[PDB]
Amino acid sequence: GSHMRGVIRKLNDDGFGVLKGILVPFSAPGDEIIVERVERVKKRRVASQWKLVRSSPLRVKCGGCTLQHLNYDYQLEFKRKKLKRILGFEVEVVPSPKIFGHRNRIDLAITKDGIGFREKWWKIVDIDECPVFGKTSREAIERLKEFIEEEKISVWNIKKDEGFLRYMVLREGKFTEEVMVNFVTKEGNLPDPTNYFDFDSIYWSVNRSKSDVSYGDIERFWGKEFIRERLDDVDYLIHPNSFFQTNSYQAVNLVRKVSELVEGEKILDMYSGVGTFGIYLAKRGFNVKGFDSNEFAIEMARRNVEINNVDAEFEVASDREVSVKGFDTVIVDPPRAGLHPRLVKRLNREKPGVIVYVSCNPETFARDVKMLDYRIDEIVALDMFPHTPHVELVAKLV
Numbered sequence: 001g002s003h004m005r006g007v008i009r010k011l012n013d014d015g016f017g018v019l020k021g022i023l024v025p026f027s028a029p030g031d032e033i034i035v036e037r038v039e040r041v042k043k044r045r046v047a048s049q050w051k052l053v054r055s056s057p058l059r060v061k062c063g064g065c066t067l068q069h070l071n072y073d074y075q076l077e078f079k080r081k082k083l084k085r086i087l088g089f090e091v092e093v094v095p096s097p098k099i100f101g102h103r104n105r106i107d108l109a110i111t112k113d114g115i116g117f118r119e120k121w122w123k124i125v126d127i128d129e130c131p132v133f134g135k136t137s138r139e140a141i142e143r144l145k146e147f148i149e150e151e152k153i154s155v156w157n158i159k160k161d162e163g164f165l166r167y168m169v170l171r172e173g174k175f176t177e178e179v180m181v182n183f184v185t186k187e188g189n190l191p192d193p194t195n196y197f198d199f200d201s202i203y204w205s206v207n208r209s210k211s212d213v214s215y216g217d218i219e220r221f222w223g224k225e226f227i228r229e230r231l232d233d234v235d236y237l238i239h240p241n242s243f244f245q246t247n248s249y250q251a252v253n254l255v256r257k258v259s260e261l262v263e264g265e266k267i268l269d270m271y272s273g274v275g276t277f278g279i280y281l282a283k284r285g286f287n288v289k290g291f292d293s294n295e296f297a298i299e300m301a302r303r304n305v306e307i308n309n310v311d312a313e314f315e316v317a318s319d320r321e322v323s324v325k326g327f328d329t330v331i332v333d334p335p336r337a338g339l340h341p342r343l344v345k346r347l348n349r350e351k352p353g354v355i356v357y358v359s360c361n362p363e364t365f366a367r368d369v370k371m372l373d374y375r376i377d378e379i380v381a382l383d384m385f386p387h388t389p390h391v392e393l394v395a396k397l398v
């Protein structure tokens with residue numbers, strides 16, 4: 001009886017409530033609940049069925065949005081506290097300017113039983129609109145159902161992993177009102193999508209790999225080759241296969257903030273991607289060199305340099321090998337793995353006077369600052385990811 005009943009007192013780091021040891025997703029501190037069945041997962045007990053007996057006062061759909069039943073102020077509190085446990089000290093979480101309509105890219109699985117996101121890998125949640133992306137998704141999804149029905153398009157059967165059409169990935173410039181649709185399919189032939197959509201760019205991508213990925217090789221496009229997003233005075237070309245900061249309104253704060261934290265004239269944009277921070281800084285007359293191991297990112301960074309009339313130099317390079325000799329500030333914005341030991345080595349050997357570390361993984365961040373011959377001087381967290389447990393750190397190291 002009572003071992004399966006109680007009030008939730010805390011959420012763990014992934015945002016799941018904990019009831020007397022049981023993990024209970026989509027619960028809130030102050031909820032009073034009864035766990036009707038548990039499973040074993042990664043050797044922890046997870047409630048698979050539970051009943052809400054009394055609502056938490058912290059209570060108020062998207063894929064990954066495991067905090068969405070929580071009011072937004074409490075999401076920010078959970079983040080402050082998560083960051084304070086982890087980093088051992090206190091850090092402001094800047095709220096996202098918009099918490100609906102903020103997201104500039106979504107992947108919708110297109111499946112035999114519905115268009116939407118995965119629940120349950122087999123089971124699709126069918127949606128008519130994605131509020132984190134916003135109202136463009138309603139129009140895209142109704143146009144997509146007409147396209148599939150009139151053209152009799154083969155859609156993904158996820159039990160059997162078969163079918164031609166697998167994702168519609170929607171991208172939009174929040175500050176430009178340009179919209180891009182990308183159809184991700186298997187091998188085969190996509191009918192002309194032209195007269196079914198009214199967007200700036202339509203892409204067809206073929207994923208020839210065996211992975212379940214919401215991108216593939218560009219097979220063809222109609223309309224614009226690129227759309228644009230604009231962060232203050234800076235334009236960035238958006239393409240289906242390059243990464244861009246997913247919350248355009250917090251990305252504004254993110255670029256503003258990095259440019260406040262840097263020192264000198266010589267900036268290394270390390271792990272630059274498409275040049276978000278290097279190029280915003282080149283436009284405010286800094287002197288910029290960036291490096292990224294991804295070749296296509298670098299190509300996009302160079303196309304972005306061209307459209308922004310700045311002079312910033314981007315090259316392909318690995319962090320096992322990039323040199324940091326000669327700079328006033330190094331910006332690092334590493335992948336999940338964190339800083340390569342060799343680059344920390346070379347940074348401690350050359351010690352540039354400021355490193356600005358941008359991270360979405362506060363624990364790898366702290367692992368790396370303790371490996372660095374450097375002190376956290378300033379740190380601010382930005383709520384780049386409303387409704388999920390993730391947060392983004394910007395720290396000035398010295």
Ligand SMILES: Nc1ncnc2c1ncn2[C@@H]1O[C@H](CSCC[C@H](N)C(=O)O)[C@@H](O)[C@H]1O
Pocket residue numbers: 243244245271272273274275276277291292293294297317318319320333334335
């Ligand atoms: N060993 C390595 N060396 C250099 N770059 C790497 C790397 N492993 C991954 N990367 C790159 O690290 C970057 C981390 S994301 C960087 C985001 C970028 N500042 C932006 O504004 O969009 C990615 O672009 C990825 O291509």
